[PDB]
Model the fold of this input.
Amino acid sequence: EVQLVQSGAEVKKPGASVKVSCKASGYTFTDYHINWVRQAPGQGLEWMGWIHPNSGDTNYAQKFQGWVTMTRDTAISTAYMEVNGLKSDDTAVYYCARGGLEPRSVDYYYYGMDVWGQGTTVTVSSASTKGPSVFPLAPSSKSTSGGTAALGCLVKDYFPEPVTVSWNSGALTSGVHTFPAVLQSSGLYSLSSVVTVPSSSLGTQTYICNVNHKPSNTKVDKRVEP
Amino acid sequence: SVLTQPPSVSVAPGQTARITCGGNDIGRKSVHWNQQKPGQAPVLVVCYDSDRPSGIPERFSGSNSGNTATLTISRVEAGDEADYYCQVWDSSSDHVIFGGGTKLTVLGQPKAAPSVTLFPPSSEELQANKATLVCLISDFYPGAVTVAWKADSSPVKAGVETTTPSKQSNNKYAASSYLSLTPEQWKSHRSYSCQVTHEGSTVEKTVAPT
Done:
């Protein structure tokens, strides 16, 4: 069956280039256009352009023309997309898709996309293994149920995923809410972990978040106080 | 040329979902529709306005007239949850254009409004010459939210980082949003706000350097 097999994840420094590949099988490569479409995290599909592998002719979208390059190697049935001068807005999944929907009318002479590749993830980042900085989030009762308080730990600017967080060395698990990390424009991650506790415990009970980033061999035990 | 879709549509199981795609004189073009199920590659569900590729359920129907193309899904089932996109080709610019996409939720539980918790920068972070505001959003359904930040009364777009929602053990959703500032910025305004919009209702929390 028709498949488009795409290359794997890349992590690239700002200003660098990345060249991703799309290998066609199950049909004759020169029979159909290859389209490229990218999708930034949580956002919409954005068409970049197409190439026809027979002629080699390209059609670049205005937004991408001249800092990306589409090529193909028909000897190995592979299309390439090269993105230059990478910036944080270029962190995205890059898809290739076959122009297999033949036009039905000369008035709309367009080959639509039918079969999609699985996408190549490109992360623009300073890219080096980096340990987190951990900051306390001091207790507040403003947004919790009556008689309770939320306190937490901010775990900032680490790479790659993941970081783990426990409280009081695991002795505290009720009321813990660790939020999955955000990948920032910087290409570094941040996450937060909050626990909800009795407000009467605050002047008395000690709360420590235990943070572990194994890739950087970093552990932090941060005391969180009123 | 621009194609407009609603960011989200919610429908009960068994009811009919309608997803619109607006475009000036879109009726003249042939419209194709993609379904992108969570974490899966896009697939074609409707081609040339109203045709179904093989394998696609007969419940999927398309229409195109005047200024609006519409994807219709009858007797919707949970497995239909996905982001849907229309696309056309604009001959005047030789561009392929995708609509902004529609998140379709098939309602498996009643709607649930978000709880919002906002933390100011810690004195420790400020000492490290950084400032991060932390806005934690939980217990909402459907799992779609938008976050806006303000400095005093003015919108702030720089330095904002927001997660996609993630399903909690209670089967509701959580997300988080972060605003990065310089200590000088943080100290020179009277307040900052995190505004969370969910299903047309808004929760706003505010913190002040004082």
Remarks:
- Chain B has two domains: 1-108, 109-209.
- Chain B touches chain A through 52 residues (CB under 8 Å).
- The helical segments of chain B are 123-127, 183-188.
